Every structure is written in structure tokens, then in C-alpha cells.
Design a protein around this ligand. Structure first.
Ligand SMILES: [Cl-]
Ligand SMILES: [Fe+3]
Length: 186
């Protein structure tokens, strides 16, 4: 039974229940993430920015079946075009706006990757992607406002592929954590 999370801590407790089993009800998880009303004081600990690129800040290690982290996007910071390594990927905006651009998986032939669509994700909205849906790029296109997002990945994963927009060629990258549980992790 899905109740409104009262706080981030409450959301985390609820997520541990929703991931107690071996499968994932995507619509239920998205609904509870969306229902949490971002309260900046509850997540300030994790909102550690870097001047030059977006940061990944681990919030909860989950129960073996998922991770939860906070990503902090300075003005103009964005990602590569990338996949999510056969995992579910939920993205909830906590502050600001992000642009999500969707791409299809490339064919073996070297070719420009042309966007299939784009949308603006706004405060408190929860979006979802998986590899069957496609690849994406996420960017804070603002010149004046940092963005903060809450991401849930299931299963956890620590590598993905970045795709060259000119050719569709991919390269494996190891994803790193700027902090874990509020502690900077150089
Ligand atoms: Cl993501
Ligand atoms: Fe992503």
C-alpha cells in the first residue's frame, strides 16, 4: 500500500519495502518518488557540488537490490549520451530543471546519433528510463540555477557506456561517487 512519503527518510523506508522482493513495480516506485515533496533541509547534506561537472552523492545503499543517490548539476553541467547497464533508472528533480534528450541505440554502422525527443523535467517530477526505452543525455541548461536530482538505480551498477554523438561508438566508463552518506570520498 503506497502512502505519501513525509520526508526523505520516510521515502527511503518506503523504498526498502518496494524493493523487498526480486522484481520492481516501476509505476509504484515512480509514484512514490513523485509524491515526496522535495524539502531542501532534508537533503542538504548530500548536495555537494563541484565547479566543473555534476557530482554523484550516495544517499542509501539499499537492500542489495537498489541504490539511491543525489546528483548536483552546476549551471551548464550535463552528461554524456549513456545507457544504464540493464538497470532501472528513476530520476526525480529536487531543485531546478533538467533537459532530458532521448536517443535510440545505434546500429553497428557509424552514423550521427539523432535525438528522438526531448523534454524539460521540472521540480518534483519523476522520470524513468531503462535500456529498452533507449539512451539519454541529461543536462542543466540553466545559466543561473543549479539543479539537484534524486536517482534510484536497480540493481545498482557502477559502469555504463558513453556514446559518441557523431558515430554511435561507445566507450565503457566507471561511475564514481563524490560522496557517500554525506562524507566526501576523494
Ligand atoms: Cl541517470
Ligand atoms: Fe542517466
Amino acid at each position: 500500500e503506497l502512502l505519501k512519503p513525509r520526508t526523505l527518510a520516510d521515502l527511503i523506508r518506503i523504498l526498502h519495502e518496494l524493493f523487498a522482493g526480486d522484481e520492481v513495480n516501476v509505476e509504484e516506485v515512480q509514484a512514490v518518488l513523485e509524491a515526496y515533496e522535495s524539502n531542501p533541509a532534508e537533503w542538504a547534506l548530500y548536495a555537494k557540488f563541484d565547479q566543473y561537472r555534476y557530482t554523484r552523492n550516495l544517499v542509501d545503499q539499499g537492500n542489495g537490490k537498489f541504490n539511491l543517490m543525489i546528483l548536483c548539476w552546476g549551471e551548464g553541467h550535463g552528461s554524456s549520451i549513456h545507457d544504464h547497464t540493464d538497470s532501472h533508472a528513476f530520476l526525480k528533480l529536487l531543485q531546478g530543471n533538467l533537459k532530458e534528450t532521448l536517443f535510440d541505440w545505434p546500429d553497428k554502422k557509424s552514423n550521427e546519433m539523432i535525438k528522438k525527443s526531448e523534454r524539460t523535467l521540472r521540480e518534483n517530477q519523476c522520470a524513468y528510463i531503462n535500456d529498452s526505452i533507449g539512451l539519454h543525455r541529461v543536462e542543466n541548461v540553466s545559466h543561473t540555477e543549479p539543479a539537484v536530482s534524486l536517482h534510484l538505480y536497480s540493481p545498482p551498477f557502477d559502469t555504463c557506456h558513453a556514446f559518441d554523438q557523431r558515430t554511435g561508438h561507445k566507450n565503457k566508463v566507471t561511475m564514481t561517487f563524490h560522496s557517500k552518506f554525506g562524507i566526501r570520498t576523494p
